[PDB]
Design a protein around this motif. Structure first.
Motif, PDB file in Angstrom:
ATOM      1  N   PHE A   1       0.844  -1.198   0.000  1.00 22.95           N
ATOM      2  CA  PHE A   1       0.000   0.000   0.000  1.00 22.95           C
ATOM      3  C   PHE A   1       0.876   1.244   0.000  1.00 22.95           C
ATOM      4  O   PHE A   1       1.963   1.240   0.596  1.00 22.95           O
ATOM      5  CB  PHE A   1      -0.831   0.070   1.281  1.00 22.95           C
ATOM      6  N   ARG A   2       0.383   2.316  -0.600  1.00 20.34           N
ATOM      7  CA  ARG A   2       1.041   3.611  -0.454  1.00 20.34           C
ATOM      8  C   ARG A   2       0.427   4.329   0.756  1.00 20.34           C
ATOM      9  O   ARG A   2      -0.810   4.451   0.860  1.00 20.34           O
ATOM     10  CB  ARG A   2       0.896   4.460  -1.727  1.00 20.34           C
ATOM     11  N   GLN A   3       1.283   4.787   1.675  1.00 15.99           N
ATOM     12  CA  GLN A   3       0.836   5.613   2.795  1.00 15.99           C
ATOM     13  C   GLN A   3       0.391   7.012   2.360  1.00 15.99           C
ATOM     14  O   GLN A   3       0.807   7.553   1.306  1.00 15.99           O
ATOM     15  CB  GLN A   3       1.930   5.661   3.900  1.00 15.99           C
TER      16      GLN A   3
ATOM     17  N   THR B   1      -7.066  -7.757   6.271  1.00 15.05           N
ATOM     18  CA  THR B   1      -6.279  -6.800   5.494  1.00 15.05           C
ATOM     19  C   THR B   1      -7.098  -5.599   5.090  1.00 15.05           C
ATOM     20  O   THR B   1      -6.610  -4.461   5.117  1.00 15.05           O
ATOM     21  CB  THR B   1      -5.674  -7.511   4.296  1.00 15.05           C
ATOM     22  N   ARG B   2      -8.341  -5.828   4.684  1.00  9.66           N
ATOM     23  CA  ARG B   2      -9.178  -4.700   4.265  1.00  9.66           C
ATOM     24  C   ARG B   2      -9.351  -3.739   5.464  1.00  9.66           C
ATOM     25  O   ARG B   2      -9.272  -2.516   5.318  1.00  9.66           O
ATOM     26  CB  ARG B   2     -10.552  -5.179   3.832  1.00  9.66           C
TER      27      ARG B   2
ATOM     28  N   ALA C   1      -6.160  -1.761   6.289  1.00  7.79           N
ATOM     29  CA  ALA C   1      -5.942  -0.623   5.417  1.00  7.79           C
ATOM     30  C   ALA C   1      -6.835   0.558   5.767  1.00  7.79           C
ATOM     31  O   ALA C   1      -6.408   1.729   5.646  1.00  7.79           O
ATOM     32  CB  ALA C   1      -6.161  -1.027   3.979  1.00  7.79           C
TER      33      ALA C   1
ATOM     34  N   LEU D   1      -4.642   3.509   4.354  1.00  4.83           N
ATOM     35  CA  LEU D   1      -3.712   2.993   3.341  1.00  4.83           C
ATOM     36  C   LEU D   1      -4.336   2.856   1.960  1.00  4.83           C
ATOM     37  O   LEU D   1      -3.669   2.445   0.979  1.00  4.83           O
ATOM     38  CB  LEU D   1      -3.164   1.661   3.793  1.00  4.83           C
TER      39      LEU D   1
ATOM     40  N   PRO E   1      -4.719  -1.384  -2.413  1.00 10.75           N
ATOM     41  CA  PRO E   1      -3.394  -1.912  -2.742  1.00 10.75           C
ATOM     42  C   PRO E   1      -2.849  -1.231  -3.989  1.00 10.75           C
ATOM     43  O   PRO E   1      -3.636  -0.856  -4.888  1.00 10.75           O
ATOM     44  CB  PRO E   1      -3.677  -3.397  -3.065  1.00 10.75           C
TER      45      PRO E   1
END
Length: 165
Positions: free
Chosen positions: A122-124, A142-143, A146, A151, A154
């Protein structure tokens, strides 16, 4: 087409929402690249892989998670997901060794059936570094993770299949 193995393999669906891959990620164990959906032996993946990430702003930060959604077995995955690894604050264009290991790498040891071992990047958010406190590796989502850490979707994902030897 680029996300195809993730959709056919049900990673997109079971673990991740649909996304547009935008960062190239290469996961390798002793210089052998992980190929989406191919089977590996657990003995081959007993130490953490090298994870190189490519392109984009040098100032960007990324979070990597590795999860197994098929626990204890894929047909009745009542412990899902099992968390294997979290690295945060990885600088763009570098690799996981440059980030903060928040959850140490746990070697794949699938108990029943064939399990998917999934890496998700992920990109912060801009100007944010994160340090998740994860009390348990079982029932990880995971969802939800994020959402908790802002986050987004993906930016890359890859996975391998593994079963007890």
């Amino acid at each position: 087409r680029v996300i195809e193995p993730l959709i056919m393999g049900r990673v997109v669906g079971d673990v991740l929402d649909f996304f547009t891959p935008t960062t190239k990620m290469n996961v390798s164990y002793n210089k052998k690249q992980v190929s989406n959906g191919h089977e590996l032996f657990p003995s081959s993946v007993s130490s953490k892989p090298r994870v190189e990430i490519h392109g984009g702003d040098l100032r960007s930060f990324f979070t990597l998670v590795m999860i197994d959604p098929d626990v204890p077995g894929p047909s009745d995955p009542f412990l899902k997901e099992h968390l294997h690894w979290i690295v945060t604050n990885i600088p763009g264009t570098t690799d996981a060794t440059f980030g903060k290991e928040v959850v140490s790498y746990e070697l794949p040891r699938p108990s029943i059936g064939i399990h998917r071992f999934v890496f998700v990047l992920f990109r912060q958010k801009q100007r944010r570094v994160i340090f998740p406190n994860i009390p348990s590796r079982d029932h990880f989502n995971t969802r939800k993770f994020a959402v908790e850490y802002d986050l987004g979707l993906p930016v890359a994902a890859v996975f391998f299949n593994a079963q007890r030897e």
